[PDB]
Design a protein around this nucleic acid. Sequence first.
RNA 1: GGUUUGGCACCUCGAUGUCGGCUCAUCGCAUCCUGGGGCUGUAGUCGGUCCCAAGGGUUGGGCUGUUCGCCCAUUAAAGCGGUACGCGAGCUGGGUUCAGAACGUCGUGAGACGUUCGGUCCCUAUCCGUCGUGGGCGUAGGAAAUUUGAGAGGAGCUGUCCUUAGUACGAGAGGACCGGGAUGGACAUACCUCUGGUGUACCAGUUGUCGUGCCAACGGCAUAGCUGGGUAGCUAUGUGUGGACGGGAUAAGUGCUGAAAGCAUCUAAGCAUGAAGCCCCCCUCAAGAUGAGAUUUCCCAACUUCGGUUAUAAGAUCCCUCAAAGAUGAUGAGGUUAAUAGGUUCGAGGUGGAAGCAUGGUGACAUGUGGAGCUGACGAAUACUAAUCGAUCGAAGACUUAAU
Lengths: 113, 121, 214, 53, 121
Amino acid sequence: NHKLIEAVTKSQLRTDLPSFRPGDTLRVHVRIIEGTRERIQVFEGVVIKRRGGGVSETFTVRKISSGVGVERTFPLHTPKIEKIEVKRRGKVRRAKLYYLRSLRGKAARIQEI
Amino acid sequence: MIQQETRLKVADNSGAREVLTIKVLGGSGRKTANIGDVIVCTVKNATPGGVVKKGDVVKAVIVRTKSGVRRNDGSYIKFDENACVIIRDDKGPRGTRIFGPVARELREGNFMKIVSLAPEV
Amino acid sequence: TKGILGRKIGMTQVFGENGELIPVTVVEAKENVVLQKKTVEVDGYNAIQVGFEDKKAYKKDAKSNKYANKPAEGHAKKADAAPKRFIREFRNVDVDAYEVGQEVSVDTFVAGDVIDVTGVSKGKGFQGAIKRHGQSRGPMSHGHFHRAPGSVGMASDASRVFKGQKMPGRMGGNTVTVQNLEVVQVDTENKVILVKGNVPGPKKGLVEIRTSIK
Amino acid sequence: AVPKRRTSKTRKNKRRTHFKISVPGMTECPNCGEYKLSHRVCKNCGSYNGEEV
Amino acid sequence: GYRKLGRTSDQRKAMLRDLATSLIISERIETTEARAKEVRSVVEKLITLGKKGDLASRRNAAKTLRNVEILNEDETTQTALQKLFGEIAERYTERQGGYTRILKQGPRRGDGAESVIIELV
RNA sequence: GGUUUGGCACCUCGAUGUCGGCUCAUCGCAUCCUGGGGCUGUAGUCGGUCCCAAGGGUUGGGCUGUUCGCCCAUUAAAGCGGUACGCGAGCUGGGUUCAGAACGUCGUGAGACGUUCGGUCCCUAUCCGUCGUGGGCGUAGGAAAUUUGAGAGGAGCUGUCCUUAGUACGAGAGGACCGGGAUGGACAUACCUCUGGUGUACCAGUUGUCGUGCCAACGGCAUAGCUGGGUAGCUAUGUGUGGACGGGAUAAGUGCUGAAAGCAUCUAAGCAUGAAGCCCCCCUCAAGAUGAGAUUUCCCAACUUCGGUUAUAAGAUCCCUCAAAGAUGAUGAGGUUAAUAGGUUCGAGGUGGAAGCAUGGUGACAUGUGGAGCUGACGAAUACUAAUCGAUCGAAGACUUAAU
C-alpha cells in the first residue's frame, strides 16, 4: 500500500489463522462478556463475503437459526475470535454468494468437493 | 431502520400477527429506531383466540431487524425479518413464549424477561 | 503545549487493548525546525515559527518552486537550517524553544489527548444550492421545482436582497479545525502520529496539530 | 427579460476593455531564420532542434 | 475512463481501433491534439503483445485491431495483424517503452484544432 | 394597537390581475418552552397568577379546495401577529371567474342565482440587489514569505436515568430544592478505515443474428442487449467532532449603612449581590483599515547635463507536461541541476480457473497442468517518449521641521 500505513500496522496484524475461500462452512469461537464468567460461545455457518482489503478485511458467515436466518460479520484480526476451524469445503463458482439470501432449505445447499 | 408506518411481525403468542407502526417514542422529530426501543403499534391482523383483538393501540419493542446493530468490537449482525414483542404497561412481555432468536443487544438490566425466554440470544 | 506540522497519509484502524476498535489517521511529521522567535522585546506578540519538509538550496536558472530563492534562503540561514517549504507559526507556547533552529520532537505528544487538527478542507468545487447548503428540493413528479432555490427575499416592501442569502458558488476550501481528538500511538523511525478519527484535508495535505484550548 | 433603457456609448466602450486578443508568443527558428510559434515545428524548412524535425 | 472525447462511450471504443490499425500501416498520421494524447496509450499497449509472440497474444491482440490488407510487399499480401509480429515487433525488441511521439503542427484552418503528428519512434 | 368585518373613493382601468399549501426567509413582544424573581387560600410533588427576558427551539398524520377548525399518537413546547392577508419574470392551478352539459328553483319567454363532471398558467436578465471569482492602479525604491485584528460574520436548544435520599416536609398516600455524574433526540461541520449506494475504456456467465473461408477461438448490434460481482472517486442511512467552563458590567428582585422627616426607611450622597440576555472567551473572513500598519530576508551602475533617462539585478510570466485545484482565468505540483504525465517492469485491490494440449465419456460437458489468466483512476521503480531553442515585463529611492 503506502508503505508507511503498512509499516505501522504490522503489530496489529494478527496471523495464526487457517486459510479458506467462500463456499466453506466454518466454526467460530467468539469471547462474549455476557455473564458471571466471560464465556466462549460458538457460531456455525457458511461464509459469504471477502477476506481482503489489508488490515481491515472482514468475512461474513450466515446460518439458519430457528427458521429466521441470521448473519454475522467479523473483523478478521480481532482479539475476540478465539480460533477458527473448518467443517466442509464447497465448490461455488463465485466470489461473493448473495444468492443464498433468498433460497429456502434444499435450494440453499452447496455440494462438497 | 424502522419508520412511521412500516409493518412488523409479532414474535410471540400474545394473540396477534402483523402490526403497523404509529409513532416512534423518544425525542421529538424522531424518524427511525432500531433494536431495543419502544414504539406504538396497532394490530392490523390477529389470531382468533387471543387476548389482543384487531384495531388496538399497543406498544412493542423492536427485537429483530434487517439493518442490525454495530457492537463494540466492530461485529455486525443482520437478521432477515423484522419482528417485535407486545409489551405491557410496566416492562414485561404480554405473551408467554417467543418464537425466534432475539438480538444479543437487547438487555441492559431492563428487559430481563424477553432474553430469559428466547431459544437463543 | 506546542504543536507540530503534518502531512496526511491515510486512514486505517487499530484495536484497543480492551477489545474496542479505533479508526485512526496516519499523520507523518518529518523534519521540523524552529525558524525564529517573535517576542515582545522587538515589535509585537509572543510566538515561535516552525517549518516543514525542506527544499533544495538554490540554482541560477531556478525555474519553479522546487528550489529556494534568495529572499527565502537568508531567512533560513540565521537559524542555520535547510530552506523549509511549508512555513507556519504557533502562538501560546513556552520559550523552551531556542530561537536558533532546534528540531521539534514528535515524542512530545505521547499521551496528550487534547488535539486540534487545523487542515484546509477538501475543496469540492461542485456548486449548487442543494449540495452546498443542504436545502430541500421540490416534488419530482407532481410539480416542477426539481432542484432550485426559492424566494431570495420577501417582496416589494423590501425591494432588495439582504446581504447574506444562500446562493450557488464555489464550495469547499475554507480552513476548518476539529476539536478534542485524542492520540493513539506515537512513533520514532517513521515519525508518525496516529490521531484518532478523521482530519480535514485531502491526502498529501497539511495539518497543524496543536494542544486544545477548552 | 428585455432592457429597460438604451445602454449608452460610455457604458458600451467600458464593457469591452477586456475584449481583445493576445500576442501569439513567437520565437526565432534558428536554422531557417524565420518566426515560428513556440513548441511547434516550422512551416518552411525547419528543424525542431531538440528533435531535428 | 481514461479521457472521453465527445463520443458516446460506444464510438470512442471503435474510434481508437480506427487510429491504431492505421498507424501501424502508414507509420504516421495527422490528427487533432486529444485524439493523439490517447492513441499513444493504445498502440504502446499493443507492440507489447508483439514482443511476446504467443498463440494467446496473436488472438488477444486481434480484438483491438481491424482486418485490413496491405499489397506492396512487392506484390504479396500482409494483413495488419501480420505487419505486427513482424517488421514492427522486431524494430523495437530492445526499447522498453516509449514507442511514439507527438509533433505539434499548428492550428488548422476553419476549425481551430491544434493539429499534431504522431509517429512511431 | 391597525391583524378582522367595515366607512371615505386619494393612487393605478394605453393591466395594481385574485385563495391555501410546498421552497426559502426575515422581523415585533402583548412569551407557548427553557433562564432569574415577587405574592399565594404555597406542607411535599404538582400548580395558579403578575413583573424582568427575543438567545435558540416550536412534531409526525387522517377528513376538507380550505381559511378557520374537530380528532388520533407523541413532546421540554406544539406561541400569537407584520412583511402587496410575505414569496406565481421561483413552483403548484385543486380552487374562484370563460365557451360545453345536467339537476333544484325562479322566468309565459331568450335566459338566471345554490350544488355538479370537464376545462392552454408566456419571456434568451440591460441597470440596482445578492453569491462566487479574476485583471488595473494605489499604500514614495523594487521583490519573496510570515502575521497583529479596526471592525464584521458563525454558534447559542434540551430530554431522561442513577446518586445525595426513600433523607427534608407529611395523618397517610406520595416525595424534593441546591449540587455530582453517565447516556440519547433534533441541528450544524468534517471525512471514506468500517456496514452499504453509484461505479458507461474493469472481470465473468448467456439468448438472437451477420462478419473474421470453415471446427476451435473472438469482434459488431439489440437501453450499457440482459443478468452476477466490482478498485479509485464522489456520497449517507455509515464513522469521528461540536454547543464546554469561566470572567467583567447590568434588568426585575433581595440587600447593608444612612438623612431629608430626633423614629422609620434598599438611596438622594456611599456600598454589596443578581438571568439562557449584553460585552469578551471558542471557531472563520479581514490592512482598498486611502487612518492603506508590523517583523525577518534579498537585489544597490554605468550614463548624460535629459533638471532626468535606457536597461538589467532580486523577483514573477507568456509557452509546453499535469493535478491534491478547476466553467474560463486563479491556486498548487514540475520544465534536462528533471520523476510532472505516458509507456515499462513489480505489487496491492477486483474477478474466480484463460487459451492450447494431455486424460475420462455415445455426446452435452467434467478433471489435471495452475489461486490460473486478464486487470480504468491507488503504491513503488527506471529517463525509453514528450516537457526543446527561446522571449516579454521589472529598482535607482521627492519635500519640510524638531532629533543624531
